[PDB]
């Protein structure tokens, strides 16, 4: 039992709700958030805009200093840093971004990074901004995601429409 609330169950480890990631952050204190991260962490919008923007910008100084040493992230790729005033952990995982041209194949790869943790707060990879098609993405979300997640959907229209059409 843990303290997620107000979720839809779409398989035996997939959760799905219509929900503010930073609020459901700041009240679950969940023990791992999901930032939808570039491979630069620069957190300008989107989930990325929005989380930093909760932290006081704190999350874009230590991503920062994180680049300064180790340099850009690999699409599909992830990094641990902390989860600041919204949870334990953050994991920055970077889907390809549609608009800039990166392959949908790396979707898989980027929610393989879920599987390293066992219970997560987290957005659709490559949605939104980043250009890919939420459904499908929930499709290889739930196709690569073993552990349990807890997917936080910001739009209500987009929601109702991904349970709608969940097989
Ligand atoms: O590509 C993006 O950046 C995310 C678009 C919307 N995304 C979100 N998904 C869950 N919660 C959310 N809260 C937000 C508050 C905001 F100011 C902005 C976005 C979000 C948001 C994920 C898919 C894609």
Redesign the pocket.
């Known amino acids: 039992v843990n303290s997620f609330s107000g979720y839809l169950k779409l398989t035996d480890n997939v959760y799905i709700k219509n929900?503010?990631?930073?609020e459901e952050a700041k009240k679950v204190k969940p023990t791992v958030v999901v930032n939808?991260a570039n491979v630069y962490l620069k957190h300008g919008?989107?989930?990325?805009?929005?989380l930093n923007k909760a932290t006081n910008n704190a999350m874009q100084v230590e991503s920062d200093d994180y680049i300064a040493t180790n340099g850009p992230l690999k699409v599909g790729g992830s990094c641990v840093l902390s989860g600041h005033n919204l949870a334990k952990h953050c994991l920055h995982v970077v889907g390809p971004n549609v608009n800039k041209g990166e392959d949908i194949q790396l979707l898989k790869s980027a929610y393989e990074n879920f599987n390293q943790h066992e219970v997560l707060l987290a957005?659709?990879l490559?949605?939104?901004?980043?250009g890919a098609d939420?459904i499908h993405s929930l499709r290889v979300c739930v196709d690569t995601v073993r552990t349990n997640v807890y997917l936080?959907?910001?739009?209500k229209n987009l929601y109702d429409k991904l349970v709608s059409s969940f097989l």
Do not use: E, M, R, T
Not at 45 to 50: F, L, P, T
Not at 126 to 130: D, L, P, T
């Open positions: 929900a503010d990631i930073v939808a919008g989107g989930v990325a805009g929005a957005p659709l490559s949605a939104g901004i980043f939420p936080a959907v910001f739009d």
